[PDB]
């Protein structure tokens, strides 16, 4: 039972609860941004400089 | 200090449950929605009317304003 394990390990002692928020936010950021950017670029295929850049990128 | 000097109260019993023993959003279909509808119903005829009137006056005035910009052929039939 994850809810119980969570409660015991993470949410019971206020110290661990804060630790869970911090460690939780660090992981949420990394994930959430990658996904958002991923979504945004897919919705705009070949329109961003990231996409057309190769055409003039060639010293 | 504002708790304890408020009102003379007698013979009222109240019962409540911890938030962890009950449901946050209970009986959505059996109680919630019916009431939402109930509330909407009881007010629609007090609120809607004037807003509807406003809309009309709006539409009229907007169209009437554009109609006055158009030309009346009855000013050039002579020539």
């Amino acid at each position: 039972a994850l809810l119980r394990q969570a409660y015991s390990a993470l949410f019971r002692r206020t110290s661990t609860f804060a630790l869970t928020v911090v460690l939780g936010a660090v992981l949420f950021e990394r994930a959430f941004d990658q996904g958002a950017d991923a979504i945004f670029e897919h919705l705009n295929e070949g329109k961003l400089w990231k996409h057309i850049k190769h055409k003039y990128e060639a010293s | 200090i504002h708790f304890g000097n408020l009102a003379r109260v007698r013979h009222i019993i109240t019962y409540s449950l911890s938030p962890f023993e009950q449901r946050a959003i209970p009986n959505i279909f059996s109680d919630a929605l019916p009431n939402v509808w109930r509330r909407f119903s009881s007010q629609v005829f007090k609120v809607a009317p004037p807003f509807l009137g406003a809309y009309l006056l709006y539409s009229w005035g907007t169209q009437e304003f554009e109609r006055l910009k158009r030309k009346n052929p009855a000013d050039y039939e002579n020539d």
Partner: protein, 241 residues
């Protein structure tokens, strides 16, 4: 003189709330401006460095800026002098001041285009309809010498002669330079000139929505949770009676 024609809504590729600008189109639009509009239209708020990472390469931008001579100084003897441009310079002004500008356009003043698509109702739809909307005046209407008829311009008599026509230039990317294709590109470019933050702004909008959806739901549950105590509360009146 009363009555005005309102442009139509074209389906720009950057119109969707989540749709960025087509940078390839912006790049061509820059070319149009640089080779056609920049002859009479200033774009004071944009600099060559702004192109870098958007429509051009750093090497490309540096070359573009060097094609221009800028006035620097004073020097040792307190003299002004010319020098080749740097990417930190802003697009060159066609005229020293407005008086000189009008002087070269029949007393008409071609406005700076840095914010044009936001300084006009209609935005790009307006600028686009205008560029491609020149035509002969209807019966009863006479355009005074020097002015050109455009139904999309208020008063319908604009001081700008149709600026673009088919093949008036060549896109070095190989796109067919038709008149409407050109107008479309320069308008997309104008959008970007007005708000370079455009793409980032929308990318942020996306993140704002997701987090807003997530967070609002979460907070709704919490509010409900706490209030459940009062919502389900029951009371009774029990007098000794």
């Amino acid at each position: 003189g009363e009555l005005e024609l309102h442009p139509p809504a074209f389906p720009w590729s950057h119109g969707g709330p989540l749709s960025a600008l087509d940078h390839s189109s912006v790049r061509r639009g820059f070319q149009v401006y640089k080779q056609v509009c920049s002859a009479c239209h200033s774009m004071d708020y944009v600099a060559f460095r702004n192109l870098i990472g958007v429509t051009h390469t750093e090497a490309e931008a540096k070359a573009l800026a060097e094609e221009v001579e800028v006035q620097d100084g004073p020097d040792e003897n307190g003299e002004l002098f010319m020098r080749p441009g740097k990417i930190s310079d802003y697009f060159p002004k066609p005229y020293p001041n407005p008086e000189a500008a009008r002087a070269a356009n029949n007393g008409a003043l071609p406005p700076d285009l840095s914010y044009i698509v936001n300084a006009r109702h209609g935005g790009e739809d307006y600028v686009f309809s205008l560029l491609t909307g020149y035509c002969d005046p209807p019966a009863g209407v006479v355009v005074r010498e020097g002015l050109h008829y455009n139904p999309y311009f208020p008063g319908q008599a604009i001081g700008m002669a149709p600026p673009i026509y088919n093949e008036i230039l060549e896109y070095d990317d190989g796109t067919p330079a038709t008149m409407s294709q050109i107008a479309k590109d320069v308008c997309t470019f104008l959008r970007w000139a007005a708000e370079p933050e455009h793409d980032q702004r929308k990318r942020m909008g996306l993140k704002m929505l997701l987090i807003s959806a997530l967070l609002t739901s979460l907070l709704y549950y919490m509010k409900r949770h706490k209030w459940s105590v009062l919502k389900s509360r029951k009371m009774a009146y029990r007098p000794p009676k």
